[PDB]
Amino acid sequence: DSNNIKYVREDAKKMHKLWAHIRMAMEGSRAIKDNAKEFVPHPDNTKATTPEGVARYKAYIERAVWYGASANTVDGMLGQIFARDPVFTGPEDKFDMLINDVDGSGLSIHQQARDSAEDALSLGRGGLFVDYSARPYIKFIAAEDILNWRERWVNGAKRTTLLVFREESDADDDGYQIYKEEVWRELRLVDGTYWQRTWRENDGQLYVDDWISPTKADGSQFDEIPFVIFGSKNNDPTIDMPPMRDLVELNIAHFRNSADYEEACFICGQPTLFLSGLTEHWVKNVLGGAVVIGSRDAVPLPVNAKPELLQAEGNGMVKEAMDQKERQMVALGAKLIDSDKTQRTFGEASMEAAAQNSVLSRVSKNVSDAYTKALRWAAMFLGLDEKIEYELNSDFDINKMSPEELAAVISAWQSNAISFTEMRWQIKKGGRAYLEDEDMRNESEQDDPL
Amino acid sequence: DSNNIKYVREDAKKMHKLWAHIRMAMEGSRAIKDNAKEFVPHPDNTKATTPEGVARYKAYIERAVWYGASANTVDGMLGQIFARDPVFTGPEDKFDMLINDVDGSGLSIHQQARDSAEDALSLGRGGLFVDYSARPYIKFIAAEDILNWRERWVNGAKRTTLLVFREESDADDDGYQIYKEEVWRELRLVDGTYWQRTWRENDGQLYVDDWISPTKADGSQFDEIPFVIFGSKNNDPTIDMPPMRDLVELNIAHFRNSADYEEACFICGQPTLFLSGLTEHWVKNVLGGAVVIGSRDAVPLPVNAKPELLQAEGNGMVKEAMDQKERQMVALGAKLIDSDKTQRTFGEASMEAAAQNSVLSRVSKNVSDAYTKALRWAAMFLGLDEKIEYELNSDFDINKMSPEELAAVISAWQSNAISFTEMRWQIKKGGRAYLEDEDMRNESEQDDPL
Amino acid sequence: KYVREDAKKMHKLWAHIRMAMEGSRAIKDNAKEFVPHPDNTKATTPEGVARYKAYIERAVWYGASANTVDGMLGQIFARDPVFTGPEDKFDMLINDVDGSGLSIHQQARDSAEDALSLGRGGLFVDYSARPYIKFIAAEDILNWRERWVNGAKRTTLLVFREESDADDDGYQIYKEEVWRELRLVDGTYWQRTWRENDGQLYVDDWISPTKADGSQFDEIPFVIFGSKNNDPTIDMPPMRDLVELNIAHFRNSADYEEACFICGQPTLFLSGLTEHWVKNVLGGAVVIGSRDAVPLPVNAKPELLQAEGNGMVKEAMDQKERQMVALGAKLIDSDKTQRTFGEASMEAAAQNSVLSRVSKNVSDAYTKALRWAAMFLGLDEKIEYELNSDFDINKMSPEELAAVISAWQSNAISFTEMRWQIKKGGRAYLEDEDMRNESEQDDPL
Amino acid sequence: FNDWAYKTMSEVLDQQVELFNGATRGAIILRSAGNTGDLSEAAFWAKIQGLVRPRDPYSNADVAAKDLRQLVDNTIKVASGTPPINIPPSMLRWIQKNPQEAGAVIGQQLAGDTMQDMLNNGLAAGKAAFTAGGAVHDISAAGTGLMTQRAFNAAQRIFGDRSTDIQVWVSHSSPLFDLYDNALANAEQLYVFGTVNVRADAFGRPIIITDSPALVSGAAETLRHSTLGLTTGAILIEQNQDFDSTVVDGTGKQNITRQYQAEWSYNLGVNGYAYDIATGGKAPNPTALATAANWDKISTSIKDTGGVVLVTK
Amino acid sequence: QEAGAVIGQQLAGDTMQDMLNNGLAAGKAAFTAGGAVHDISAAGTGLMTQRAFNAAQRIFGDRSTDIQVWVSHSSPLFDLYDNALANAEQLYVFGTVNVRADAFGRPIIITDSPALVSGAAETLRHSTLGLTTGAILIEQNQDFDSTVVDGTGKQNITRQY
């Protein structure tokens, strides 16, 4: 039944195909090979109908090679984002329960943030949900589970009124645990008040719960839904296109060219004799249906007989095309692969460092804003201090910091230009220290060893 | 009370094929050639039906060459992540028995951490188990042994309700006689209490333990199951896709191309005379079925007879495919192999070092969190301090520290910026010290003997 | 699926690795298993076996694996391993580790080569009175168990083969065997030994060794060190694929050498020749020197034929030599290629991964053995034996000397640490105590 | 991978099966308790008939003799299962994020159908036991066949002074539609438009609708609906928590056959009745359970047994 | 899993029984093929006796002390017990009448191996074999495979070990 708790917006349904292709590209060779029916078109439909043709297609695909550079691009981009740990501003012991286990599963907020950035880089959509059970939990919802949202101009303000996201959990309520029970959360906003329901499909029946308005420590309910949708473009529920679409497409084209190249290498890659000007009589007399080709074994041939070894030579057009695609892939982002043959002198990349890490900066800022909002809502649940921030690493291209860098930062701290916390964070940025600020303070409180 | 103690969640069953493939790639040429049917497609299955066909396939596989760049990659990454030793923060004399023999078999925690991180690099899945016998022990459970798990949302908290793992063991019977007995451990979380059963099957009979709750030194049982699933992505019960899959695919393709290349070189590699414009009359006149080809002896041929010494030329398409596949394996950025012909500008890799050492940083943080949590669980078992850490070697591309680096570090230590212990850890990192901090302080407290 | 590891089937792999290490002779008397016969029909025949002998004898064994292990040992073993604790009390352990006068450093080197080559070994600390730190080969260990008791991974049983030769009045070669039998009952160590006299196994009753104070033992005095980790389970040898590459290169070189022997010599190939012309002027003898010229009939084309270079066989041989260097195994040096300083600094960590792993494993194994020896003698327990964890060591630079002393004047490095720095850098040889004794006096001036 | 989503639109179930535990004021219990064998019998003390006797103080004469007996309850184990399902390769074989032993819709339908089969077997067994115990009323000759509430008052009459124990009715949809139609045209006007929509039976007993085939018999004129009223804990269903499912691939034919089969069991018990395992079988069929003459009456009084069945056309 | 536990518990002992029985049968066959056999059955009463052990020890010549263990059936041991109990030769006293190491300190390992009975009814021929160290060598190949395959189509799911 449509118009249900499980109805999905149209544009999400349109985007599901692209998201599936991106996920398959992230998975690797197995997904692409199993689902190669649409990626690699059959060379001809005539045999594609026949079972001999589908056997040939199976041999064609199974021989192919999946480069898998798009997944490496993501992994590399995520590694660029995440070095050391994101900083946290505000009380720490008063937010320690969130740091140790953000959703009661022992998962630190760092790892959930890493996964959120991974999904905002690969398919470019995610969501953070802050709920109360005493402790507030910050959920993570994949873009595949976001299925409904609604926008209104309430007194001229963009207000997210409705939002339904799919919630999943293994069913353990006695019985036999046939399948896992499945949940939907209907988040509604009326007259500046946050309402919610919980729809459970158990045994084929859609249970519903009474409307409840989660309330803060002081009360007053809410004016906004504690759910932020972060993407590659901006933190709005409107769908933002995935960063990895082009690379996935180039990778797929490279994969099909690789399939063609491997077929050519399999068939025509072996040198072959091709004895010309031979008759059946001579072959049956002296050759006898078998030719010894060793160094010490010689073979005679009749008059005007020309033996010529044949195999397809290199620098072919298929290889040329796939090399062009490899260049195009590295041209659109070099996080996927590197080339030791390519020599780049230092001091030139500082001009293009800004334009290149554009996706990194956008994703980092989006995730930082989303997590700051989520932590502020969690504080509202707890009645804590709102003036807090959780910003990720915006300083990409990281490495161990040179002695001159350390001298400069120390000189900056000796003058009243960089505070002690900022200097310590800068030193930890370059991998020259690991101890936290308070421990170092307490250790340096003592007199000099001497 | 319980269902079958062995039951593989279908995801683990799906991942078993890929895990076996990656494990056998780590194995080397032996495993690949023992199971070549799954990787190397038969050149002609019509032959494969025949017995001479299987003889041909055996001869065509035994000549192949296994590169194994994947094993070298794993080794390189493991060496980079465990250069020097992981540091432990907290009481050390109290925790010394967990450091020296972490499972009671004299295996130091550093070696077990190395093995777990190796499995994280290869298969992207692992597990640490902390139990109480008396003293607590930290187990290591491979990816294949964790055969089921469960996630439930109770009070809005992602909780691991069930987690059963097959713990391999051995029977030391009266004699010296090989028995292989298995122990299955089921971990349950009911009404917020941790419960544990062992299916001992000692003597091959029912020794299934009952509902038992291991209890802390102070008491109060447990709030969470003391078992952590660490992976390449994050510390989730859900499967984390292996970081080695695409390299293994590339090595398998390179292996089949190498088999084809070896067949071509063995058959057509040797030069062959290919005498043409010949007749049997002349052959029996002069040659007599034996041609001398030394420099001291010459052989004539009749009119219009053209000898053409033929051999397979170089730079064939097979070498081209093999070379591009090796270059692709290197492009992925993996430290599988090196090339002295190539040159890289120093200071250029300083920008991409963050992206290249991504998987290393992710596995470092994941395993560090896993071991920190396991050590906290053991501390709660024995009621020690809770704020303890186990911080793996985060800094990569390690090298002997420069005199400039030494001077800068000493200058920083003399200023109230970097702690003495931090400076000592840095000096040990660069291979400029070996004694312990307290040992050096005790020795150097005295004035200079002069 | 597939069996755990290789189902402890590293026996043939260890044999192959040992034969590869032995050199060209061991490979050449094993060509049947390594180099397949080109033709089975010949292989049955006697001219076929003569052909195979000629085929294999002309081959050239490259022998890169032995150089790989030699380089790895040289990198690991520079100066001497460091010993921590009472050196005066443990001198009678270090000098004669097993009663033969062989220093502990040389046995450590042997165990390091065993770890690097086939990834297995064993240290056994027994009590004769004087503790003896034995070294047991990989093939000698022939049983081990993993019964876990009290919820803890424990090694309960372990039996290893122990080798000796008898000096009977007559210099007749007598090979007799001893089987030490280590067992662990109720967390307690028991042993029995066997003496064999040309097939006379004399068994001894189970015995309970005790420490100097007493309390007997809690764990077996035996550690199995491997390239991977110090675990009873079999660890993969580090040079498995390396041997495969060497063997493939060897067979390709056999083919190449056959080609060079047969078709490497150019020949005249006097095409268009009539036997009448031969018997007329050639007379069954062609003089080819520059002093004489040979005449030929009408429309005859002499042409020198010799197999040229850049063939596929040498292409594959160069590919496999490149593969060995590409693997990164310090096996050969290349005068042709050059690498900028600082580029290899980044990958120095990865290249020395197996080096660091083996160094740490052997250091931990020897540390544990020394703990057991101290337990037997009732000495201190805080003793360590750490190998050289800093590979590629060279003569340290004068600016590095300035840095080292400047660091020692500040209280950031100990005097012994500074002396170890200088010694490892090849700038001093006398012991720190001796230098202190000499320098405590007044200046010469 | 085209839809790339679980097709929950599948009609996993249609009959309302929310009839367990508190959904029926505890009339039908669905505890999860595992027990062995094919029977689970428990014995309580029998009620002595002539416990109190007239006595003659002037002359006692002969002395009679009374003995105490022991009655036996029964709980027959019922085993169900799933026919071999050959899962089609289809095209929706992308990696399923959440693992399901059967995958696709097999378990999504299996949970609902398991609950439906449990409820149908329980209702059929209840009807059979009540018919074998005499707690049956057949109002079919009179009028249309179902009255507004006089039909329920007849069951109250049958059960007697302990009628307060009966507190819920399980009925097919057609009897309740008939009751609605009767209410709309109130002959004896007691329904106003505000209170024309009533679920209970004017005695505080809620009526629960279910379309179970166990409550409908015959067709055309012989079509009969069975409305049964239960006391507290009248029908007990005990899940044996022994579920086993398998996925097997068959080879040898032109194409592979990937089959699925599941297996489970549960117990049934009716308050105040025993299953005559001697008359029936070790593993009763749904026909055997619904068949009478296999359900002996154990309790001495019909008031002790839980449940009465009302038959209306 | 209780069924599989029963399978394993019986299977361990049964595998060892099969290995030992095959080893003993092969050893007896090889020794008979090599001519190293002595038969006391035809000479007088056919029963175990110390003289029988000596006569069997007459093989191997001077290097006969290398024979270590006399593996045999239980019935020959009990025949030896019967002979020793009624010591017609004043060798055994009651305190030393039960010894399992009769042959000059060589013990007598006892097992009911059907490979050693080698007979039936009254024409049975019990066979005992004395061994040196390493005489019978049994080498497992460390290739143990256990497979549980399920089948569907029947009234119940079936398994197969």
PDB file of all heavy atoms in Angstrom, chain C residues 8 46 116 133 135 144 172 236 253 264 305-306 327 340 381 386 390 415-416 419 433:
ATOM      1  N   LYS C   8      49.618 -27.980   8.197  1.00  0.00           N
ATOM      2  CA  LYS C   8      50.960 -28.286   8.691  1.00  0.00           C
ATOM      3  C   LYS C   8      51.773 -29.020   7.627  1.00  0.00           C
ATOM      4  O   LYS C   8      52.584 -29.902   7.918  1.00  0.00           O
ATOM      5  CB  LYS C   8      50.898 -29.092   9.989  1.00  0.00           C
ATOM      6  CG  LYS C   8      50.457 -28.293  11.207  1.00  0.00           C
ATOM      7  CD  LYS C   8      50.347 -29.181  12.438  1.00  0.00           C
ATOM      8  CE  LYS C   8      51.562 -30.086  12.577  1.00  0.00           C
ATOM      9  NZ  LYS C   8      51.502 -30.941  13.795  1.00  0.00           N
ATOM     10  N   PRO C  46      66.234 -43.974 -22.691  1.00  0.00           N
ATOM     11  CA  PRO C  46      67.576 -43.643 -22.177  1.00  0.00           C
ATOM     12  C   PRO C  46      68.222 -42.461 -22.881  1.00  0.00           C
ATOM     13  O   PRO C  46      68.917 -41.664 -22.235  1.00  0.00           O
ATOM     14  CB  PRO C  46      68.362 -44.940 -22.401  1.00  0.00           C
ATOM     15  CG  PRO C  46      67.682 -45.593 -23.547  1.00  0.00           C
ATOM     16  CD  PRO C  46      66.222 -45.262 -23.408  1.00  0.00           C
ATOM     17  N   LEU C 116      64.415 -16.486   9.596  1.00  0.00           N
ATOM     18  CA  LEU C 116      64.290 -15.791   8.318  1.00  0.00           C
ATOM     19  C   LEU C 116      64.107 -16.749   7.149  1.00  0.00           C
ATOM     20  O   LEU C 116      63.463 -16.389   6.157  1.00  0.00           O
ATOM     21  CB  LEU C 116      65.518 -14.913   8.076  1.00  0.00           C
ATOM     22  CG  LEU C 116      65.563 -13.585   8.828  1.00  0.00           C
ATOM     23  CD1 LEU C 116      66.979 -13.045   8.861  1.00  0.00           C
ATOM     24  CD2 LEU C 116      64.619 -12.583   8.189  1.00  0.00           C
ATOM     25  N   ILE C 133      70.862 -23.288  27.410  1.00  0.00           N
ATOM     26  CA  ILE C 133      69.893 -22.724  26.479  1.00  0.00           C
ATOM     27  C   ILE C 133      70.109 -23.399  25.132  1.00  0.00           C
ATOM     28  O   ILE C 133      70.955 -22.975  24.337  1.00  0.00           O
ATOM     29  CB  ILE C 133      70.019 -21.200  26.379  1.00  0.00           C
ATOM     30  CG1 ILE C 133      69.845 -20.569  27.760  1.00  0.00           C
ATOM     31  CG2 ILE C 133      68.993 -20.644  25.409  1.00  0.00           C
ATOM     32  CD1 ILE C 133      69.731 -19.064  27.738  1.00  0.00           C
ATOM     33  N   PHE C 135      69.253 -25.014  21.288  1.00  0.00           N
ATOM     34  CA  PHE C 135      68.644 -24.572  20.041  1.00  0.00           C
ATOM     35  C   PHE C 135      68.181 -25.809  19.289  1.00  0.00           C
ATOM     36  O   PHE C 135      68.973 -26.729  19.059  1.00  0.00           O
ATOM     37  CB  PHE C 135      69.623 -23.758  19.193  1.00  0.00           C
ATOM     38  CG  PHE C 135      69.158 -23.539  17.787  1.00  0.00           C
ATOM     39  CD1 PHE C 135      67.932 -22.947  17.539  1.00  0.00           C
ATOM     40  CD2 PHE C 135      69.935 -23.933  16.715  1.00  0.00           C
ATOM     41  CE1 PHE C 135      67.495 -22.748  16.249  1.00  0.00           C
ATOM     42  CE2 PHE C 135      69.502 -23.734  15.422  1.00  0.00           C
ATOM     43  CZ  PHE C 135      68.281 -23.141  15.191  1.00  0.00           C
ATOM     44  N   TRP C 144      53.212 -30.879  19.186  1.00  0.00           N
ATOM     45  CA  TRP C 144      52.844 -29.784  20.074  1.00  0.00           C
ATOM     46  C   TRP C 144      51.327 -29.728  20.187  1.00  0.00           C
ATOM     47  O   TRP C 144      50.610 -30.065  19.242  1.00  0.00           O
ATOM     48  CB  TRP C 144      53.403 -28.444  19.588  1.00  0.00           C
ATOM     49  CG  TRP C 144      52.911 -28.037  18.245  1.00  0.00           C
ATOM     50  CD1 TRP C 144      51.770 -27.348  17.963  1.00  0.00           C
ATOM     51  CD2 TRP C 144      53.557 -28.275  16.992  1.00  0.00           C
ATOM     52  NE1 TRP C 144      51.658 -27.152  16.608  1.00  0.00           N
ATOM     53  CE2 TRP C 144      52.746 -27.711  15.990  1.00  0.00           C
ATOM     54  CE3 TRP C 144      54.743 -28.914  16.619  1.00  0.00           C
ATOM     55  CZ2 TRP C 144      53.080 -27.766  14.642  1.00  0.00           C
ATOM     56  CZ3 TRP C 144      55.072 -28.969  15.280  1.00  0.00           C
ATOM     57  CH2 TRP C 144      54.245 -28.398  14.308  1.00  0.00           C
ATOM     58  N   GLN C 172      84.100 -46.068  14.214  1.00  0.00           N
ATOM     59  CA  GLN C 172      82.880 -46.457  13.459  1.00  0.00           C
ATOM     60  C   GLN C 172      81.807 -45.387  13.675  1.00  0.00           C
ATOM     61  O   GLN C 172      81.556 -45.033  14.844  1.00  0.00           O
ATOM     62  CB  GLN C 172      82.383 -47.825  13.927  1.00  0.00           C
ATOM     63  CG  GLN C 172      83.481 -48.875  14.016  1.00  0.00           C
ATOM     64  CD  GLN C 172      82.932 -50.233  14.376  1.00  0.00           C
ATOM     65  OE1 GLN C 172      81.727 -50.416  14.536  1.00  0.00           O
ATOM     66  NE2 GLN C 172      83.820 -51.207  14.501  1.00  0.00           N
ATOM     67  N   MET C 236      54.283 -19.195   8.346  1.00  0.00           N
ATOM     68  CA  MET C 236      54.760 -19.319   6.977  1.00  0.00           C
ATOM     69  C   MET C 236      56.210 -18.864   6.856  1.00  0.00           C
ATOM     70  O   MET C 236      56.585 -17.835   7.438  1.00  0.00           O
ATOM     71  CB  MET C 236      53.888 -18.514   6.019  1.00  0.00           C
ATOM     72  CG  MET C 236      52.723 -19.291   5.472  1.00  0.00           C
ATOM     73  SD  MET C 236      53.366 -20.440   4.243  1.00  0.00           S
ATOM     74  CE  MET C 236      51.879 -20.858   3.351  1.00  0.00           C
ATOM     75  N   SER C 253      66.475 -20.255 -17.316  1.00  0.00           N
ATOM     76  CA  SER C 253      67.897 -20.219 -17.629  1.00  0.00           C
ATOM     77  C   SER C 253      68.368 -21.525 -18.245  1.00  0.00           C
ATOM     78  O   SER C 253      69.272 -21.516 -19.083  1.00  0.00           O
ATOM     79  CB  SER C 253      68.702 -19.907 -16.370  1.00  0.00           C
ATOM     80  OG  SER C 253      68.822 -21.056 -15.552  1.00  0.00           O
ATOM     81  N   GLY C 264      73.494 -20.728 -30.715  1.00  0.00           N
ATOM     82  CA  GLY C 264      74.282 -19.521 -30.539  1.00  0.00           C
ATOM     83  C   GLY C 264      75.405 -19.361 -31.542  1.00  0.00           C
ATOM     84  O   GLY C 264      75.848 -18.233 -31.783  1.00  0.00           O
ATOM     85  N   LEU C 305      73.512 -17.473 -40.171  1.00  0.00           N
ATOM     86  CA  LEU C 305      72.362 -17.539 -39.277  1.00  0.00           C
ATOM     87  C   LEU C 305      72.813 -17.829 -37.856  1.00  0.00           C
ATOM     88  O   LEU C 305      73.433 -18.864 -37.595  1.00  0.00           O
ATOM     89  CB  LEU C 305      71.362 -18.605 -39.727  1.00  0.00           C
ATOM     90  CG  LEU C 305      70.231 -18.146 -40.642  1.00  0.00           C
ATOM     91  CD1 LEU C 305      69.296 -17.225 -39.883  1.00  0.00           C
ATOM     92  CD2 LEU C 305      70.791 -17.434 -41.840  1.00  0.00           C
ATOM     93  N   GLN C 306      72.475 -16.924 -36.943  1.00  0.00           N
ATOM     94  CA  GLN C 306      72.685 -17.136 -35.521  1.00  0.00           C
ATOM     95  C   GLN C 306      71.501 -16.544 -34.779  1.00  0.00           C
ATOM     96  O   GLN C 306      70.957 -15.512 -35.178  1.00  0.00           O
ATOM     97  CB  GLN C 306      73.990 -16.499 -35.035  1.00  0.00           C
ATOM     98  CG  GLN C 306      74.168 -15.057 -35.472  1.00  0.00           C
ATOM     99  CD  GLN C 306      75.149 -14.306 -34.600  1.00  0.00           C
ATOM    100  OE1 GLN C 306      76.357 -14.518 -34.681  1.00  0.00           O
ATOM    101  NE2 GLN C 306      74.633 -13.417 -33.759  1.00  0.00           N
ATOM    102  N   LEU C 327      60.383  -7.194  -5.505  1.00  0.00           N
ATOM    103  CA  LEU C 327      59.911  -7.739  -4.204  1.00  0.00           C
ATOM    104  C   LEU C 327      60.548  -6.925  -3.074  1.00  0.00           C
ATOM    105  O   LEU C 327      59.882  -6.739  -2.038  1.00  0.00           O
ATOM    106  CB  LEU C 327      60.298  -9.218  -4.109  1.00  0.00           C
ATOM    107  CG  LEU C 327      59.130 -10.202  -4.098  1.00  0.00           C
ATOM    108  CD1 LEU C 327      58.407 -10.201  -5.436  1.00  0.00           C
ATOM    109  CD2 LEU C 327      59.608 -11.603  -3.755  1.00  0.00           C
ATOM    110  N   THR C 340      67.530   8.357  -5.476  1.00  0.00           N
ATOM    111  CA  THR C 340      67.818   9.578  -4.738  1.00  0.00           C
ATOM    112  C   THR C 340      67.707   9.335  -3.239  1.00  0.00           C
ATOM    113  O   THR C 340      66.821   8.614  -2.773  1.00  0.00           O
ATOM    114  CB  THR C 340      66.858  10.693  -5.161  1.00  0.00           C
ATOM    115  OG1 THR C 340      66.810  10.771  -6.590  1.00  0.00           O
ATOM    116  CG2 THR C 340      67.310  12.038  -4.602  1.00  0.00           C
ATOM    117  N   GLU C 381      65.279 -11.491  37.757  1.00  0.00           N
ATOM    118  CA  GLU C 381      64.344 -11.715  36.661  1.00  0.00           C
ATOM    119  C   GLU C 381      64.329 -10.581  35.647  1.00  0.00           C
ATOM    120  O   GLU C 381      63.940 -10.799  34.495  1.00  0.00           O
ATOM    121  CB  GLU C 381      62.930 -11.913  37.212  1.00  0.00           C
ATOM    122  CG  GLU C 381      61.970 -12.581  36.246  1.00  0.00           C
ATOM    123  CD  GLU C 381      62.103 -14.090  36.226  1.00  0.00           C
ATOM    124  OE1 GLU C 381      63.102 -14.618  36.757  1.00  0.00           O
ATOM    125  OE2 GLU C 381      61.202 -14.748  35.670  1.00  0.00           O
ATOM    126  N   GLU C 386      67.858  -7.614  23.698  1.00  0.00           N
ATOM    127  CA  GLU C 386      67.270  -6.948  22.546  1.00  0.00           C
ATOM    128  C   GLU C 386      68.286  -6.880  21.417  1.00  0.00           C
ATOM    129  O   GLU C 386      69.406  -6.397  21.612  1.00  0.00           O
ATOM    130  CB  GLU C 386      66.794  -5.540  22.914  1.00  0.00           C
ATOM    131  CG  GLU C 386      65.469  -5.511  23.661  1.00  0.00           C
ATOM    132  CD  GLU C 386      65.263  -4.223  24.437  1.00  0.00           C
ATOM    133  OE1 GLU C 386      66.182  -3.823  25.183  1.00  0.00           O
ATOM    134  OE2 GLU C 386      64.183  -3.612  24.299  1.00  0.00           O
ATOM    135  N   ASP C 390      67.760  -1.153  14.762  1.00  0.00           N
ATOM    136  CA  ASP C 390      68.080  -0.084  13.819  1.00  0.00           C
ATOM    137  C   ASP C 390      68.953  -0.671  12.716  1.00  0.00           C
ATOM    138  O   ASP C 390      70.169  -0.811  12.879  1.00  0.00           O
ATOM    139  CB  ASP C 390      68.775   1.074  14.527  1.00  0.00           C
ATOM    140  CG  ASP C 390      68.091   1.458  15.822  1.00  0.00           C
ATOM    141  OD1 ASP C 390      66.847   1.385  15.880  1.00  0.00           O
ATOM    142  OD2 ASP C 390      68.796   1.836  16.780  1.00  0.00           O
ATOM    143  N   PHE C 415      74.447   8.056  29.813  1.00  0.00           N
ATOM    144  CA  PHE C 415      75.820   7.845  29.369  1.00  0.00           C
ATOM    145  C   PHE C 415      75.962   6.513  28.645  1.00  0.00           C
ATOM    146  O   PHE C 415      76.636   6.430  27.612  1.00  0.00           O
ATOM    147  CB  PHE C 415      76.778   7.915  30.556  1.00  0.00           C
ATOM    148  CG  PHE C 415      78.137   7.352  30.264  1.00  0.00           C
ATOM    149  CD1 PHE C 415      79.024   8.042  29.459  1.00  0.00           C
ATOM    150  CD2 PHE C 415      78.527   6.134  30.793  1.00  0.00           C
ATOM    151  CE1 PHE C 415      80.270   7.530  29.187  1.00  0.00           C
ATOM    152  CE2 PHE C 415      79.776   5.616  30.524  1.00  0.00           C
ATOM    153  CZ  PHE C 415      80.647   6.315  29.719  1.00  0.00           C
ATOM    154  N   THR C 416      75.339   5.457  29.173  1.00  0.00           N
ATOM    155  CA  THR C 416      75.380   4.167  28.495  1.00  0.00           C
ATOM    156  C   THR C 416      74.666   4.230  27.152  1.00  0.00           C
ATOM    157  O   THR C 416      75.110   3.616  26.176  1.00  0.00           O
ATOM    158  CB  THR C 416      74.766   3.079  29.373  1.00  0.00           C
ATOM    159  OG1 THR C 416      73.362   3.320  29.528  1.00  0.00           O
ATOM    160  CG2 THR C 416      75.430   3.055  30.736  1.00  0.00           C
ATOM    161  N   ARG C 419      77.035   5.960  24.787  1.00  0.00           N
ATOM    162  CA  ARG C 419      78.113   5.058  24.404  1.00  0.00           C
ATOM    163  C   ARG C 419      77.627   4.006  23.419  1.00  0.00           C
ATOM    164  O   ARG C 419      78.351   3.637  22.492  1.00  0.00           O
ATOM    165  CB  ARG C 419      78.718   4.390  25.637  1.00  0.00           C
ATOM    166  CG  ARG C 419      79.860   5.164  26.272  1.00  0.00           C
ATOM    167  CD  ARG C 419      80.834   5.687  25.225  1.00  0.00           C
ATOM    168  NE  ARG C 419      81.601   4.637  24.564  1.00  0.00           N
ATOM    169  CZ  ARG C 419      82.579   3.941  25.127  1.00  0.00           C
ATOM    170  NH1 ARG C 419      82.918   4.117  26.391  1.00  0.00           N
ATOM    171  NH2 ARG C 419      83.239   3.046  24.397  1.00  0.00           N
ATOM    172  N   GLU C 433      82.560   1.021  30.977  1.00  0.00           N
ATOM    173  CA  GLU C 433      83.229   0.952  32.273  1.00  0.00           C
ATOM    174  C   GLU C 433      84.731   1.160  32.124  1.00  0.00           C
ATOM    175  O   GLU C 433      85.352   1.867  32.928  1.00  0.00           O
ATOM    176  CB  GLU C 433      82.947  -0.391  32.949  1.00  0.00           C
ATOM    177  CG  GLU C 433      81.513  -0.580  33.420  1.00  0.00           C
ATOM    178  CD  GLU C 433      80.711  -1.474  32.494  1.00  0.00           C
ATOM    179  OE1 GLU C 433      81.303  -2.042  31.553  1.00  0.00           O
ATOM    180  OE2 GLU C 433      79.489  -1.616  32.709  1.00  0.00           O
TER     181      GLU C 433
END
